[PDB]
Amino acid sequence: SRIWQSPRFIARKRGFTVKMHCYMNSASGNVSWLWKQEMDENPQQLKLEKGRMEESQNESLATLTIQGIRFEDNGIYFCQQKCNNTSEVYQGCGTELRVMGFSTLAQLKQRNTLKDGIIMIQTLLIILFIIVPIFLLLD
Amino acid sequence: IAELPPKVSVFVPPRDGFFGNPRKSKLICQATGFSPRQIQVSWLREGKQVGSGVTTDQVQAEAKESGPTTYKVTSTLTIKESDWLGQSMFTCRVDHRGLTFQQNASSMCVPDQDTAIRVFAIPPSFASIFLTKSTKLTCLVTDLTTYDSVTISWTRQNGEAVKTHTNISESHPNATFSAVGEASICEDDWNSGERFTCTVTHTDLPSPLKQTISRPKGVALHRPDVYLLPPAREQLNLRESATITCLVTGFSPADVFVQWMQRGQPLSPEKYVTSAPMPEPQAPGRYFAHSILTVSEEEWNTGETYTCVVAHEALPNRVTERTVDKSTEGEVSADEEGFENLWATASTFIVLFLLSLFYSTTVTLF
Amino acid sequence: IAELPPKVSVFVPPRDGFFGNPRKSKLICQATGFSPRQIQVSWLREGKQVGSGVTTDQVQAEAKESGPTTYKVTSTLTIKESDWLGQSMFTCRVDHRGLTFQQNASSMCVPDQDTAIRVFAIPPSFASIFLTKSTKLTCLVTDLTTYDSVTISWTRQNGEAVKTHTNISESHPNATFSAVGEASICEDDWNSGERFTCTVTHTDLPSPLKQTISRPKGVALHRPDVYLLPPAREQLNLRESATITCLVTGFSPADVFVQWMQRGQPLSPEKYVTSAPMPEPQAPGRYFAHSILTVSEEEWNTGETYTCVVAHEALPNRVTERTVDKSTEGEVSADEEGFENLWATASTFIVLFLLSLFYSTTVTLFK
Amino acid sequence: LWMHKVPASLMVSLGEDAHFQCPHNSSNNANVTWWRVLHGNYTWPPEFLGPGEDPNGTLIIQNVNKSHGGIYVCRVQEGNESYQQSCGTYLRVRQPPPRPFLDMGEGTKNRIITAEGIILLFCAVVPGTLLLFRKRW
């Protein structure tokens, strides 16, 4: 009711940028971010990597910015603000991020069945080099 | 005894009730409600004082109960149809208490005069019902100056009148003055859909303006499609601006409703321009629409999604929402397809074949 | 006592005499010049006498020196303005000695059945005259019927020539006639904006209604740009029918003209639809327009170039062609093409290994 | 408090039958409703999805098609008290599964291809040495 975040569930390709928004009052202090991966049910304190992660705080608006993502970023995020006049913790509804990969259903099936065929063939080459040298060198 | 001036007004005759051979007519310039007695009702025909037919009657004492004892007089100028249609200025010059009252005159039937302008009639849309439960109906009369003697009534199919109307329109720069005559109405009456009509009257025309409006029936209902097209790749190279196109296609009936959510709050209502339906070529009875939106190129390079909403009474839950940023594409499998394994096979077989040549060549030697 | 009826009439007030809150004026039921004393006066607003707002006078004598000295009476009905504009009939039924003396009256005495009609024409439109290079103009004339010597005389700046029109119709269902008056003119005169009046001559009233109409000197010039858009991926995933769209922006002034083209032959006009110009949101009035065109998708998944053209004053050759067909992808990314690029290289070294040990087992095996 | 306990997203394929739980805090005598909303700071009103099913207050959707996206929110209120709005679990209709090559991962497949290259070469060297270099003696 008081703290408001958006969007809710993002699905970006590996490589691009995302942005997240947090709207509440410019009255009692600043906002601190969190981080929480799938395993816990207790969050942590977020690191801000120099360059790769950024943050701004405009008039009635503040924003986490993240460039250059990869698979170790599957987080569920939180902007958090405890009151400075009543001392009450207020906390939003988070966001989620899940980072996709390049290929499609066409090339994935072809390379899977293809390279399965390749490893079948070269394992048959191990069959040739496990039958021929022992039988031949043992005469 | 106060010097009360009268109301000088030539009660003009109609053009049909004429008697005599040649056909004659009276001019009654009845100015009453004046004290004291002194008045000079001098008939001027085109500025020239009339002597023929001037019947200046007795200045009778109005024995009024309040105020001073005022007076009344009823002058009479007998003219002809050769005088009434003679196109002369029959000025009822009243020199009441030394105050000359040149009553301007006319010598025909006077329509007003030759001009008729414009009027609109906006039906209430479907999306202006399920928002506010406030089923208005208006009719904008416009393109005039805000004067008095306007009246915007409303007649049903029965010809009876309905409710009045406030907030009549205001001062406008380019003589683009107007008015908004609204009246409330029930909903199932509008759904039954008979011809509601508004009429207007000014001191501009002798003509009513029978603007008719209703709801047509009989049309079918069809779900629409939505697609969303990312911008023109040539247009990025010009380094100025982008476009986006919403597109709805193949629905029934008209009256669709769109707007744009980005960042969480909707846009201003002037960054984006919609369109009106026009009939489909292929299907016999459907329509389409457009929606355009422009932002710069620093904006569209940096994430910053956009979303389209539609609104239509036949879509099965009234609202859908499609969204295209830049790359929301890229099918399943978050993690795998790897990075380590591929570069690994690259390096291992490029070293391994160079470590196969010197094995094969000595086999070609011995 | 000479039993004499009064001169029964009703004199109407002027239209601009309604004042007060609400704006009101009055009436006169002139029943004057009557003897004997007995008279009855009754108004009727549409078959009903209104009670209030009535000032009926008394039976009072007139200034007469000889003859039977008659009497005068005058009822005065205070009325409202919107009621008087509302075309209500007002009858003051006088009953002098019980004799019905009516005067049906209102304020609507316009009617004009006459001959002087509106006479105009469309200008030579930039869409039409581009096709034939044949700038002409057609005098639109109604509110006139078939008389003799119905003339369409396009006078010039100071009264010059006109081709006499042919191919006349029949009369309209509302008895007027389409004087279909055309004339071809020079090519740069309207481009220089000359004054062309459709001076007419008719049998009943030969009044030439003139039209000092020229090219509207004004709006400046901008080349439109043409950005053809390819269809949508979900739409072909439906694999029913697609929608190419040719889109123009920013031209000045309005009245642009498009038509599709493929293989040189034109398409049917019932296929493709366009729209009128709309005002532009951001800039001043540099308008935009669009055009949608269905296909068969089984037509679309083959080739078939499909070009668009355009027609503006700003364009020097007045024709530009653009086309994109089925495969104009345009730089998806670089690490994707590097990705399957690199995997293609690894597959290449694999099969080169299998050939290599084909050879190194071939030489030893062929002893 | 409990207003975040429901997970953020959920994976459901086509045609499946769903599950939704809303772990309330009050004492079991409330009214349980489900509602479906839009993006945020919405201007169009939501609509009543459905009442409760079981004393667990579960919500079950059958016959999932590709038009069943959208944020689902539980609203529960007991009497004239305050009403509870959750944060809601987003849904994406994700059918198409690969025919699974479960007996390896492909990150594990091609490293087995490389080590198989090493073992096949080192296995491939020495009998060609032993034959013609044990032949002439």
C-beta separation of B210 from B187 below 8 A: no
**Where do the H-state alpha helices sit in chain D?**
106-133
- How far, in Å, CA of C341 to CA of C327, rounded? 20
- How far, in Å, CA of B232 to CA of C340, rounded? 27
Tell me whether strands C79-80 and C71-77 are parallel, antiparallel or unpaired.
unpaired
C-beta separation of B141 from B152 below 8 A: yes
- How far, in Å, CA of B293 to CA of B269, rounded? 11
Question: Which residue type is seen at D14?
Answer: L
CATH of the domain at B96: 2.60.40.10
Taking only Cα atoms into account, the Rg of chain C, rounded to an integer number of angstroms, comes to 41
- How far, in Å, CA of B287 to CA of B264, rounded? 31
C-beta separation of A3 from A26 below 8 A: no
One domain, residues B210 and B230: no
Residues of D in contact with B309 (CB under 8 A): 38, 44
One domain, residues C124 and C77: no
Q: Whose CA is closest to B344, among C354, C356, D118, A120? A: D118
**Where do the H-state alpha helices sit in chain B?**
81-84, 187-192, 233-237, 297-300, 340-365
Which SS3 state, helix, strand or coil, does residue B140 take?
A: strand
Q: Sort C68 into a burial class: Cβ within 10 Å, 0-12 / 13-18 / 19+.
A: exposed
How far, CA to CA in Å, does C50 sit from each of B222, C43, C54, C55?
Answer: 57, 7, 8, 12
Tokens standing for A52? 């790769």
Indicate yes or no: CB of D9 within 8 angstroms of CB of A9.
yes
DSSP B19: B
CATH of the domain at A75: 2.60.40.10
- Other Cβ atoms less than 10 A from the Cβ of C116: the count is 15
* B334 → closest Cβ in A7, A23, A100: A100
Q: Whose CA is closest to C350, among D118, B349, A127, D110? A: B349
* B337 → closest Cβ in A18, A103, A105: A103
In a domain, B347, yes or no: no
Domain range for C240 is 225-308
DSSP letters of B318-362? S--EEE--S-----S-SS-S-SHHHHHHHHHHHHHHHHHHHHHHH
C-beta separation of D73 from D35 below 8 A: yes
Tokens standing for B5? 């001036």
Spell out the residues 6+ positions from residue A86 whose beta carbon is closer than 8 angstroms to its own.
none
Number of residues assigned to chain D = 137
Residues of D in contact with A4 (CB under 8 A): 40-41
Indicate yes or no: CB of C350 within 8 angstroms of CB of A118.
yes
Indicate yes or no: CB of B337 within 8 angstroms of CB of D106.
yes
In a domain, B365, yes or no: no
Tokens standing for C38? 């007995």
- How far, in Å, CA of B203 to CA of C165, rounded? 42
- How far, in Å, CA of B207 to CA of C126, rounded? 38
A1-38: b (≥16 Cβ within 10 Å) or e:
eebebbbbbbbbbbbbebbbbbbbeeeeeebebbebee
For residue B36, cis peptide bond before it (omega within 30 degrees of 0): yes
* A17 → closest Cβ in B263, B303, B333: B303
Indicate yes or no: CB of D88 within 8 angstroms of CB of A105.
no
D102 touches chain C (CB under 8 A): no
Indicate yes or no: CB of A126 within 8 angstroms of CB of D119.
yes
Residues of D in contact with B307 (CB under 8 A): 39
Nearest residue of B to residue D115 by CA position? B348
- How far, in Å, CA of B185 to CA of B157, rounded? 13
Indicate yes or no: CB of D131 within 8 angstroms of CB of C360.
no
Residues of C in contact with B280 (CB under 8 A): 273
Crossing angle for the helix pair C335-365 and A105-137, to the nearest 10 degrees: 20
Indicate yes or no: CB of B275 within 8 angstroms of CB of C271.
no
Question: Which residue type is seen at C15?
Answer: R
DSSP B316: T
Helix (H) or strand (E) holding B308: strand B307-309
The widest CA-to-CA distance across chain B, in whole angstroms, is: 155
Taking only Cα atoms into account, the Rg of chain A, rounded to an integer number of angstroms, comes to 26
Ranges of beta strands (E only) in A38-109 are: 44-45, 53-58, 61-66, 76-77, 79-82, 89-91, 95-100
Tell me whether strands D9-12 and D90-93 are parallel, antiparallel or unpaired.
parallel
Residue appearing with tokens 């083959």: C302
Cβ-Cβ contacts under 8 Å between B and C: the total is: 149
Question: Which residue type is seen at A95?
Answer: T
- How far, in Å, CA of C295 to CA of C309, rounded? 18
In a domain, B143, yes or no: yes
Residue appearing with tokens 């039976």: C59
Helix (H) or strand (E) holding A105: helix A105-137
- How far, in Å, CA of B23 to CA of B19, rounded? 5
Class of the CATH-defined domain D9-93: mainly beta
D125 touches chain B (CB under 8 A): yes
Number of structural domains chain B divides into = 3
Indicate yes or no: CB of B292 within 8 angstroms of CB of C288.
yes
Q: Sort D129 into a burial class: Cβ within 10 Å, 0-12 / 13-18 / 19+.
A: exposed
C-beta separation of C229 from C222 below 8 A: no
In a domain, C53, yes or no: yes
DSSP letters of B86-115? TT--EEEEEEETTEEEEE---SS-----S-
Tokens standing for D87? 């944060």
Which SS3 state, helix, strand or coil, does residue A20 take?
A: strand
In a domain, B345, yes or no: no
Technique behind this structure?
Answer: cryo-EM
One domain, residues C212 and C229: no
Indicate yes or no: CB of A105 within 8 angstroms of CB of D96.
yes
In a domain, B344, yes or no: no
Question: Which residue type is seen at A112?
Answer: N
Helix (H) or strand (E) holding C359: helix C335-365
Indicate yes or no: CB of B309 within 8 angstroms of CB of D121.
no
How far, CA to CA in Å, does C45 sit from each of B178, C89, C105, C108?
Answer: 32, 6, 10, 15
- How far, in Å, CA of C138 to CA of C184, rounded? 9
* B363 → closest Cβ in C271, C342, C363: C363
- Other Cβ atoms less than 10 A from the Cβ of C8: the count is 23
Q: Which of C54, C76, C105 is the last residue of a domain?
A: C105
C-beta separation of B258 from B246 below 8 A: yes
Resolution of the structure in the document, Å: 4.1
- How far, in Å, CA of B329 to CA of B321, rounded? 17
Indicate yes or no: CB of B336 within 8 angstroms of CB of D39.
no
C-beta separation of D32 from D52 below 8 A: yes
- How far, in Å, CA of B51 to CA of B43, rounded? 8
Tokens standing for B284? 């016999």
C-beta separation of C308 from C300 below 8 A: no
Helix (H) or strand (E) holding C237: helix C233-238
Chain B closest-CA separation from residue A108 CA (Å): 8
Chain A closest-CA separation from residue C222 CA (Å): 37
DSSP C104: E
C-beta separation of B135 from B182 below 8 A: no
One domain, residues C195 and C141: yes
What would the 3-class secondary structure string for C303-339 be? Answer: CCCCEECCCCCCCCCCCCCECCCCCCCCCCCCHHHHH
B298 touches chain A (CB under 8 A): no
Taking only residues 317 to 356 of chain B, the set having a beta carbon closer than 8 angstroms to any beta carbon of chain A reads 326-337
Residue appearing with tokens 């390896």: D104
Distance from chain centroid for Cα C338: 59
What would the 3-class secondary structure string for C3-22 be? Answer: CECCEEEEEECCCCCCECCC
Question: Which residue type is seen at C3?
Answer: E
Q: Which of C76, C105, C134 is the last residue of a domain?
A: C105
Q: Whose CA is closest to B161, among B196, B137, B193? A: B196
- How far, in Å, CA of C29 to CA of C53, rounded? 13
In a domain, C336, yes or no: no
C-beta separation of C85 from B201 below 8 A: yes
- Give which of B268, B332, B348 to mutate to test D binding, by max D Cβ within 10 Å: B348
DSSP B123: P
- How far, in Å, CA of D134 to CA of D136, rounded? 6
In a domain, C147, yes or no: yes
DSSP letters of C248-276? EEEEBSS-----EEBTTBPPPTTT-EE--
Chain B closest-CA separation from residue C39 CA (Å): 21
C-beta separation of C253 from C218 below 8 A: yes
Q: Which subunits sit against A, judged by 3+ Cβ pairs under 8 A? A: B, C, D
Domain range for A53 is 4-97
DSSP B161: B
DSSP B14: P
